[PDB]
Structure 1
Amino acid sequence: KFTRSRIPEKVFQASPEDHEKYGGDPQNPHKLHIVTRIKSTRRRPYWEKDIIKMLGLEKAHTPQVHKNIPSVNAKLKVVKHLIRIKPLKLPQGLPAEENMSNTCLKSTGELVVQW
């Protein structure tokens, strides 16, 4: 029959060849995921429609932020083929109570202040 898929953990094991291929690092991982939907929930089982409805990814591309904790990754490992995950980058730090209304997210995934 057709059933949920339990992905073996072996795939989610970055190698020494993958690390220098994307801008990441084993130690000191990244706080937040910026996730976008690039595929339709239609034509896919209901246990993916519901997940997408839960992560706030209902609309199309429209990026949305989530924690990088396993409780959410378990959800993103089910919808990993209908989304693009990039790591949010903060090369100027979290904004203060000033500069909340003057932020901007660039296509490279960096949140910055005053454009």
Structure 2
Amino acid sequence: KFTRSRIPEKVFQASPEDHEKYGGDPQNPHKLHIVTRIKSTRRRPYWEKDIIKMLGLEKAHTPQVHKNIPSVNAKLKVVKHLIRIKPLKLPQGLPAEENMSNTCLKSTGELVVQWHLKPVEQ
């Protein structure tokens, strides 16, 4: 019989070898997540369809931010085979009200608050 999957807890332990391979810092976990559906919800069980519905991942290749908390992580682990998870980087920090319209999420995973559409003089 085909039922839901109980993913072993041993899978989600970041060994030191993976730490420098992916560049993550265990001492300073990332604040937020970037989730992007890259697989169809069709031909998948109904419970996974609801999880995709809850996280707002209807349209594929549409980035969405989520809180890196155990409750959100628990939902994400169900549909980990249909999405791509990347951390959020803020080189300029959290945007202020003045520059809220000048933000741009680059493809490499950071939200630069200064978007000028001008070549770098360097």
Is the pair's TM-score, using the shorter chain for normalization, greater than 0.5?
yes
TM-score, structure 2 as length reference? 0.93
TM-score, structure 1 as length reference? 0.98
In the TM superposition, structure 1's runs of 4+ consecutive aligned residues that sit over 4 Å from their partners are: none
Deviations 1:72-105 (A, max 9, x none): 0100000000000000100110011110011000
Is 2:90 aligned against 1:94? no
C-alpha displacement of 1:114: 2.4
User: Identity across aligned pairs (percent)?
Assistant: 100
Q: Which residue of 2 aligns with 1:58?
A: 58
Note the 1:31-110 alignment, pairs <5 A.
31-110=31-110
Count of residues paired in the alignment: 115
Higher-Rg member (1/2): 2
Gaps of 5+ in 1: none
Over aligned residues, Cα RMSD in angstroms? 0.6
Gaps of 5+ in 2: 116-122
C-alpha displacement of 1:53: 0.5
C-alpha displacement of 1:23: 1.8
Work out the CA distance in 2 between the residues paired with 1:52 and 1:104: 25
